[PDB]
Amino acid sequence: ANITVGDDQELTRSYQGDPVENALRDFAFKSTNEDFGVGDDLEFFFQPRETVHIDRGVDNTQWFRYDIPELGKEAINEVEVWFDDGEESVIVDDGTDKLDLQDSLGLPSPGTQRKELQRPLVTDISDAEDIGRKYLAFRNSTLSGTVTTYG
Amino acid sequence: DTTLGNELANTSLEEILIQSASSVSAWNTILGTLASTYPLVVSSSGIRPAQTAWTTESDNLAQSGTALVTVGDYSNGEAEGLDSPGDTLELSFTPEHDIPGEEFALWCRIETDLGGTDPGPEITVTLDIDGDTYSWVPIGTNTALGLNWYDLANNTFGGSSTYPDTDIPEGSTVTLSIEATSSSVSGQGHAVDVMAPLDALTRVTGGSDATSAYTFDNNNGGSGGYLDGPELYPDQLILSLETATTRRNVSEARFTLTANDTSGNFYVELANDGSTFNRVNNATSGSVTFASPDTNVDTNISLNRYGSRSTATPQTGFNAQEIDNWELYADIDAVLPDDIGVTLSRAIIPPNTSGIVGQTVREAGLKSGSTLLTRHILAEFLLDTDQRLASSESTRFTSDN
Amino acid sequence: DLANNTFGGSSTYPDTDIPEGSTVTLSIEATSSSVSGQGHAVDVMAPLDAL
Incomplete structure (x- = not known):
């Protein structure tokens, strides 16, 4: 139930000696750039990115430091x-x-x-x-910013 | 921008070409590991069944002063009558494949003395393979034959020895000479109507004898006409092509090919599962819908004898079906989910596409029929003589806010 | 030549390769009576690479 592959397709490479994290990263690259990992109760998950929001946003009164590059x-x-x-x-x-x-x-x-x-x-x-x-x-090239706040 | 500025090439992303062949190296790839003895020819013109019986009207043999014999139940009305010691009849051929020696055969249609009782000469056969000579004596000093098909290689008729079961390599120059080695009872002639060196095909057909694969008919209508066989080619090659592999399910598939003929038992068979083959009969193009979507397509092809005639032996199967080019297409997703709100489009240009091979490419665009949906400038490249070109077109949907 | 040619014979040499350094033993044997004439007289025998 924790598996929700976004573009489920057959593998045409044998993954037979890759690190498990690197194989899962290649599957996410092949399918919708998914999030994966170990959750609460020690269950594995693999599912669509960007599923939940944090309502307490970092408003202009709530950051204390920032450092926001574009890395290239x-x-x-x-x-x-x-x-x-x-x-x-x-x-x-x-x-x-x-x-x-x-x-x-x-x-x-x-x-x-x-x-x-x-x-x-x-x-x-x-x-x-x-x-x-x-x-x-x-x-x-990506932004990879740091922002510091409190909660 | 309404359209690409001088478009070089265009391909679908509703269908993708999952297999093709149009050249010797491509055919040798998609046929898989055929044995060197398999009666199939791969060539710059196409793939075709090998000539596998030779069959020469006796008046068209090479002559050494043997006696001419004329009778209505002889093919073309006339035969050559082995009579005077050393009066060779000779035949030359080149086999398009290796012939295994344990199923080489030398069928001849032959008689003694117009159907008389009294023995012909003893006859020696010499087979020459680019200078390697193999000789045997199938006909003895005391035998007479009624008009019928006899194998002079694997059987003897008062003779002392058979063909020595040697293999014959592809492309070898093969020569037979058939010779009366001692004199006949009178000036009678041992009349040979037609000579047919062949591969008996017991490798291909489950029978122990060439009669399971060729027509050895023995009645031309008695009027100087011609026999129906032996036909020059094998009856049916059911070729199994290498699996067309896919990352994605195939719901339906379409083929196209070029052929010299499509009559008789010609067909293409396609399967999603390697056993539920769907058949298209007697056509150079066709489409198949599978019972359910599944990822790999297997293919079978039937190539056969064709032609019927009234002016030379054999009257049947003197031509074979050839395929010049082959293409297999499948209904496959080539526009794909790639992230949240992002699609990736993966069109392909086949390696030898005319109008773009040898050309500098500078732009690309996602399209639908005539209408251009997207356009891009590309860093210049030359699409050289054997190169697959493919897209990795991202389309993203996003807000301003 | 006996290997790749034949005279009324039943079978010829199958064209198998000979390895370097292999110990090769060749035997010629009569397998019927002769008609007369002191048999086949073997004067010189030469197994060879035809090159």
Whole structure:
């Protein structure tokens, strides 16, 4: 009853040695970016994100300190994934960040910044697309603010 | 923006192409591990049953001065009569597959002395495989045969030895010579009407003999006409193709193919579960709805003999059905939930799509029929000669407040 | 050649590979009476790689 997969689909990779937390994180990346963990009564859960609200919001009289960056140090805009026995490849390709670096800096061609990685147990190309998409997504620009309050 | 500025290529995301073949390496992938002896040819033109019997009208054999024989119940009205020592009849072929030696056979339709009682010559067969020569004596000095089909390889008729059961490799230049090695009782001729070296197909058909796979008919209508077989090709290859795999349920599937013919027992069979096959008969395109949605599609194909004729042997099955290109499509979700209020769209461009192969790609858009729903600029790339291109289009729904 | 050619014979060499360093033993045996003529006279025997 604690399991509510948002886009339930078959796995086409064998997860047979991954850390359990890393496998669950890949399933959440494949299905609706879900929250998972250990609750009260020590039950596991896996379910849709953003389900409850806290009515006592941090109003302007109720913060004491804040520190709110946009983190982009580790971002990149191309990943090439080798899969099969290293015998086929796929490039996952963010065109927006390449063009924005080009126009910003005045580069003669799109501002590619790459990672190469290899997953030699992946055989379904559409899983190697996931691997590369997941690598870009977890590195992307985000706000990651700290706010301090009391209750 | 109403439309893409010079659109190069367009593909559906209601259907996705889960399998295809159009080239030797693709066909060798989706056929799976066929044995080197299986009577199927993969080629730049398509996949086709192998020629598996040769069958030569006796007047079209290579000649060494043997006696011409004319009778109405001989095929084409005429046969060659083995008579004078060393008067070889010779036949050449190249097999499109490995023939296992324990089921090679040499059917000939043959008689002695216009149906007379008195023995023909003793006859020697030599089979030559690119210079490797195998020789045996199936017909003795004291036998006469009534007009019928006889295998000179696996049986003897007063002779001393059979074919030596050697395998014959694919693409080998194979030559037979059939020779009277000592003289006949009179100037009679041992009349051979038609020679048919073949694979007996007991590997493919559960019977112990070629009669289970070929027509050995023995009556042309007595008027200089022709026999119905042996037909040049196997009756039916029921090919089982490798599973078309999916992450998602398939509710219905559609196929398309190119073929030289679709007559007779030609069909395509599709299943969601590997056993409940639904059949489309005698068509190059078709659609199947499955009993319930399930994730992988299995396929079977039937390729057969075709053609009927009145001017040469064999009168039946002198052509075989070939498939040039194959495509299988399935009703699969390619627009997917991805987060709270977010969808991901995952269209695919097949690796050799004309109008975009060898082309620089610079923009993309989510679309529905003619109307463009979204447009994007892309960093330039060249879609090179073998590359699958696919989308990962996020569409987000959100408020201002 | 006896291995890949035959003269009224029942069977020929199946084309199996010979491993490096394997101990190969070759035997030629008569399996009928001769008609006359001191049999088949074996003058020179040469198992070989045809290259």
